[PDB]
Design a binder for this molecule. Structure first.
Ligand SMILES: COc1cc(Nc2ncc3ccn(-c4cccc(CCC#N)c4)c3n2)cc(OC)c1OC
Ligand SMILES: [Cl-]
Ligand SMILES: [Cl-]
Length: 329
């Protein structure tokens, strides 16, 4: 068995109403209050449009939800309501339906986001520390509120690089953590899936998000994006094992009594645990420090229970420059 090291009992200590999302009843307003301007993106079960609120000329974003169980919609809405006002959590402004189609939609604050594929390549050492610290604030907050995001990746982190404002978005895969609950492993996006997901270990927790965050950190400081570039879910674990080593993998599986899909027998091979310094070269050297490598080593661990918590990560020396700069000249 496995239990989160932090925030394990959060939900059981709260009113049932807090976590019993199936009982939540959203109030659906009129989407006619919003003029859609342009498409910003899409997902498996949504598309998102920039919009103007006709009544007050506020620029917002409208996420039109594609056909899903009402249950998944209630989950996302209740989670967003529970996290509202939290540090660096996207603000849910309203829940609306189009009168003709009857299609439900969520309205969020607009962030003047720079595409990560443009942004990450101009970030300084300090900028990476700063934004990673901001994202950690969001994760410590949601974890403290009993919620796992389960889809941390650059696409889900909106950054206004002028305002220095970061928001964690797309809470559609987020879930309430309950100790000993077995969860579906078909979460996250391939390059950000923790080893627990890839070996079908269901008793995971908030620490899944910390794997994903470590993947982001590695891509930012080393400039190899994505960092672990699997061709499929099987190959994803092989790419991880080429860095973290196979001995440590087999150790992890034995510790948690995880049976390894035998398709891995012929593709994993035997790999040493690598030095993180191996990834340094002339074009990324300025973004790498001993502190960054120590943090990465403590996030990207097979054993989910051994990974730093969001708060432990915030306390790491890598972020000392950020903590110091929070008092302006
Ligand atoms: C993403 O690109 C851009 C995004 C934004 N701004 C923005 N602000 C808030 C939210 C909330 C959800 N979203 C979103 C958008 C697209 C897709 C998804 C994923 C779920 C679905 N479908 C969420 C948001 N996007 C601005 C831009 O330009 C100013 C962009 O262009 C760079
Ligand atoms: Cl979203
Ligand atoms: Cl250190």
């Amino acid at each position: 068995g496995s239990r989160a090291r932090v925030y394990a009992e959060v939900n059981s200590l709260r009113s049932r109403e807090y976590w019993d999302y199936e009982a939540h009843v959203p109030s659906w307003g009129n989407q006619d209050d919003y003029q859609l301007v342009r498409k910003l993106g899409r997902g498996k079960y949504s598309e998102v449009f920039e919009a103007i609120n006709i009544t007050n000329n506020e620029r917002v974003v409208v996420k039109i939800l594609k056909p899903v169980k009402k249950k998944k919609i209630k989950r996302e809405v209740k989670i967003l309501e529970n996290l509202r006002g939290g540090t660096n959590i996207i603000k849910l402004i309203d829940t609306v339906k189009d009168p003709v189609s009857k299609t439900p939609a969520l309205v969020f604050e607009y962030i003047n986001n720079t595409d990560f594929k443009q942004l990450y390549q101009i970030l300084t050492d300090f900028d990476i520390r700063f934004y990673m610290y901001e994202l950690l604030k969001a994760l410590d907050y949601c974890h403290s509120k009993g919620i796992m995001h389960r889809d941390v990746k650059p696409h889900n982190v909106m950054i206004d690089h002028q305002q220095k404002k970061l928001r964690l978005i797309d809470w559609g895969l987020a879930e309430f953590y309950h100790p000993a609950q077995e969860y579906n492993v078909r979460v996250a996006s391939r390059y950000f899936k923790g080893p627990e997901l890839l070996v079908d270990y269901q008793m995971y927790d908030y620490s899944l998000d910390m794997w994903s965050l470590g993947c982001m950190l590695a891509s930012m400081i080393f400039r190899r994006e994505p960092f672990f570039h699997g061709q499929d879910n099987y190959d994803q674990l092989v790419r991880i094992a080429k860095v973290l080593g196979t001995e440590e993998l087999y150790g992890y599986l034995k510790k948690y009594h995880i049976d390894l899909d035998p398709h891995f027998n012929d593709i994993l091979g035997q790999h040493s645990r690598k030095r993180w310094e191996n990834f340094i070269h002339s074009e990324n050297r300025h973004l790498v420090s001993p502190e960054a490598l120590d943090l990465l080593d403590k996030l990207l661990r097979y054993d989910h229970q051994q990974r730093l918590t969001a708060k432990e990560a915030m306390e790491h020396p890598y972020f000392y420059p950020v903590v110091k700069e929070q008092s302006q000249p």
